[PDB]
């Protein structure tokens, strides 16, 4: 007998299994297609979700209902200190897939990336990469051989880069290490670019430029085990099938938000990063009283539209869009008018203590 009253499916079959992500760091399951017409350029970056605020910008969107009006948008602030390139990986195309032929590491590895290789840094004798450092000092002709192998046989070149988590106001001391595929140019060109970028820091100012459309990928917030109500949106003799909604894990899944716009890439060393041409009023992106549960932003930061997966102080990966999409929203410029840095720890009412002090009387303290 047929179903009398039909409705669309309560869930999405393309996101199950609703199991816990086997990773804390956002994985890049697709890098943008390579092209030898364009020489070298990176394609991804790694940041930490500090917090989110709201801004006011003048919308120059031709044909829109609110063309040339002042609009309010929620924005996410991700602190992006420069990442140190410490390795290069060569990938060879095989009838079985992309296979990592070899890996070359930089001579001097910081304690930041060395902590990644241990579950307990203090008990360890710190013997990792010691003999690699010895052979690097002794004979560079060997390392030249693997790079020759990479530029001779490998088709995809990726750089191992770790984030300087020490710079961020995070209690974690392990640095996050990932591979960013070097898109563009010949394999030799990518290998050279990796060599002259060994042990130096690549910054977000060189990766992204404040107007492009990116994919932000990360692990979502954990809501714990949940019943069918909030896990799935639920209101003949057989056996229960996979399509039936069930009770289980809700949250902590690997997700990918597409089409995120950078409204601003600000520099940490600059003290005008939260000030705009319509605002003046010297201030920093950190809200009054510091970000709730994160701290004070002191390094380079990126302001994206909307919301990104995961809670504060979690690591996000920002990749260049795989496919070009020239929607006028993705092509329009952004001219910020005002940024809110009031206290998010409660109902804040003042932007900076300086401008709060004139309105308030002389406090006895």
């Amino acid at each position: 007998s047929h179903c009398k009253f039909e409705q669309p499916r309560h869930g999405s079959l393309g996101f199950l299994p609703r199991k816990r992500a086997s990773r804390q760091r956002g994985k890049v399951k697709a890098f943008p297609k390579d092209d030898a017409s364009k020489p070298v350029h990176l394609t991804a970056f790694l940041g930490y979700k500090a917090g989110m605020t709201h801004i006011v910008r003048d919308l120059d969107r031709p044909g829109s209902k609110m063309h040339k009006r002042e609009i309010l948008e929620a924005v996410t602030v991700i602190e992006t200190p420069p990442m140190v390139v410490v390795g290069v990986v060569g990938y060879v195309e095989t009838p079985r897939g992309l296979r990592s032929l070899t890996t070359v590491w930089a001579e001097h590895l910081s304690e930041e990336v060395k902590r990644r290789f241990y579950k307990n840094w203090f008990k360890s004798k710190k013997k990792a990469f010691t003999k690699y450092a010895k052979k690097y000092a002794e004979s560079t002709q060997s390392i030249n051989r693997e790079l020759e192998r990479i530029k001779k046989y490998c088709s995809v070149v990726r750089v191992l880069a770790h984030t300087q988590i020490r710079k961020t106001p995070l209690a974690q001391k392990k640095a996050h290490l990932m591979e960013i595929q070097v898109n563009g140019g010949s394999v030799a060109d990518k290998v050279e670019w990796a060599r002259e970028h060994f042990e130096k820091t690549v910054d977000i100012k060189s990766t992204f430029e404040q107007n492009e459309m990116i994919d932000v990928i990360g692990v979502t917030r954990g809501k714990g085990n949940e019943g069918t109500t909030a896990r799935w949106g639920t209101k003949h003799p057989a056996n229960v099938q996979w399509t039936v909604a069930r009770a289980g894990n809700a949250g902590y899944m690997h997700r990918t938000q597409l089409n995120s716009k950078i409204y601003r890439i600000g520099a940490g060393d600059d003290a005008k990063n939260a000030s705009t041409d319509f605002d003046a009023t010297e201030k920093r992106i950190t809200p009054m009283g510091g970000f709730v549960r994160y701290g004070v932003v002191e390094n380079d930061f990126v302001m994206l539209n909307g919301a990104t997966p995961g809670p504060v102080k979690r690591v996000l990966t920002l990749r260049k869009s795989l496919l070009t999409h020239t929607s006028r929203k993705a092509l329009e410029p952004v001219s910020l008018k005002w940024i809110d840095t009031a206290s998010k720890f409660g109902h804040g009412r003042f932007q900076t203590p300086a401008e709060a002090k004139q309105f308030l009387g002389t406090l006895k303290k």
Binding site: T94, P95, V240, W242
Partner: protein
């Protein structure tokens, strides 16, 4: 027709069912078989009908946990393996051990490109199919059913053919030198009445 440890079959121009049946009989006999270049196996019937056959094969899946449902393999080597194992008693230890004696690959990998590759006449399309009959290629049906490694194999096969052609030219030159010295040697005519 002598028992070798390993028989490398160049599956180019063969018929899927006929080659599978011959291989399945050899595995039960206890012979290691390596079927290289599986993107060139031929199947009788025109391409659209074969793709309809395969796309009907995808339709078979469990209604609970398609993860436990039928596993549809798209690689031409895996297509040949499915054809072979269907001709074997793989539910028993004998058939399961027989499957372990078969290595079906895509292209001709370096460990097997430097070894003689015999062919099966009982499976060859040229000898077994009436001229004027439509057929298809597994390496083509695979690309339009989901297989995504066609370009890499074709490129790595052009490299292999170039290297093999260079090797054969060098060996042919050496064989020409040996062949020239042959009649120059005298006993080859002096007492050759035995037929050699």
């Amino acid at each position: 027709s002598e028992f070798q440890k390993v028989v490398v079959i160049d599956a180019k121009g063969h018929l899927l069912g006929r080659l599978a049946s011959v291989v399945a009989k050899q595995l039960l006999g206890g012979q290691k078989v390596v079927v290289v270049r599986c993107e060139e196996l031929n199947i009788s019937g025109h391409f659209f009908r074969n793709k309809l056959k395969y796309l009907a094969y995808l339709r078979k899946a469990c209604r609970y946990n398609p993860s436990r449902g039928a596993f549809h393999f798209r690689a031409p080597s895996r297509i040949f393996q499915k054809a072979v194992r269907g001709m074997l008693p793989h539910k028993t230890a004998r058939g399961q051990a027989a499957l372990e004696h078969l290595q079906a690959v895509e292209g001709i990998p370096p460990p097997f490109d430097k070894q003689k590759r015999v062919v099966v006449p009982a499976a060859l399309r040229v000898l077994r199919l009436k001229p004027g009959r439509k057929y298809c290629t597994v390496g083509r049906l695979s690309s339009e059913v989901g297989w995504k490694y066609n370009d890499i194999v074709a490129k790595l096969e052009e490299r292999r053919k170039v290297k093999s052609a260079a090797f054969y030219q060098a060996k042919l030159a050496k064989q020409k030198k040996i062949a020239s010295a042959k009649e120059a040697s005298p006993v080859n005519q002096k007492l050759s009445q035995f037929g050699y």
